[PDB]
Design a protein around this ligand. Sequence first.
Ligand SMILES: CC1=C(/C=C/C(C)=C/C=C/C(C)=C/CO)C(C)(C)CCC1
Ligand SMILES: CC1=C(/C=C/C(C)=C/C=C/C(C)=C/CO)C(C)(C)CCC1
Lengths: 161, 161
Amino acid sequence: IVTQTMKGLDIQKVAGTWYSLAMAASDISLLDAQSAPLRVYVEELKPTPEGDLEILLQKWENGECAQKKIIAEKTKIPAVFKIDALNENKVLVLDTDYKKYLLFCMENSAEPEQSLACQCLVRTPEVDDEALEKFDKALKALPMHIRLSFNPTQLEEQCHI
Amino acid sequence: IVTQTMKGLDIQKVAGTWYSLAMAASDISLLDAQSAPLRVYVEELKPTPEGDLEILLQKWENGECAQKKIIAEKTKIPAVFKIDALNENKVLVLDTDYKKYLLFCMENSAEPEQSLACQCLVRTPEVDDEALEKFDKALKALPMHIRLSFNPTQLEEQCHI
Ligand SMILES: CC1=C(/C=C/C(C)=C/C=C/C(C)=C/CO)C(C)(C)CCC1
Ligand SMILES: CC1=C(/C=C/C(C)=C/C=C/C(C)=C/CO)C(C)(C)CCC1
């Protein structure tokens, strides 16, 4: 479903601390409650020397903020990664300047809109209107139905509480 | 993909302690390693008074046996439940005598064989040849590619170590 990817991505560069400024899904159910499936908060991006992508995040599970560790396996396309799991899901980097923001999404193969969510990652706990612009632009086509956004205070909180 | 379900199921009855005697998937990848997605060990079945199905299990995550809690939502069909998550997955009870064994499976909608795994649940840490018969019978049609089985000793171990 996602048609924009970042040309000439340097995945090494995207390493470090990240803030999930905003999130969007094609289904309200994926983001509605705090225990919603794709409602995850990114701690840091950790690209492996063989070009894989270790992702650190938090996610509410059974009344508690629990840090999680996911691994995105590199594919032929530099901006597309596969999360080693059921139903196979892709991780697409849409766009990034490495030092300010990063836009990427997650779509479940064989069923886009019935599985798809995007985030706007920023380096600091500052809201970046510039980045939000790019994020909305990119999503302007996508069939999104829920949209979230956090404030500097929630961003310094675990699970953006 | 799964075509046999248990007529006249009394989900209340299946409550209690359960042993994952054996497991099978349509994909070796779902069960191969200990961190394999559908490689989960069931602790106990807990059916809710409104007829939902709370499931307690263990599952290896990042070099550690971690207890997990999943919830299967009742559907129009008494033996079919839906696990509240991405890609929507069904939980089907194939057959049970409530006090000896329980056969159920998990298939991911819109893609059977590219997502499907079954277990043979027993009440005691004893291997039940009778039950294994039924489990193999039921799977005899299904396009399974990996098959596991545990021993009383592994069954009294967390994560059947
Ligand atoms: C949606 C989303 C992401 C996916 C996260 C997943 C699939 C988390 C799974 C967590 C677990 C272990 C859940 C089971 O309890 C990634 C970071 C790819 C990119 C940004 C959007
Ligand atoms: C295969 C299988 C089961 C499914 C388990 C699942 C889907 C576990 C998910 C765990 C998490 C939270 C993983 C993310 O890290 C159930 C008990 C339905 C029935 C027996 C076969």
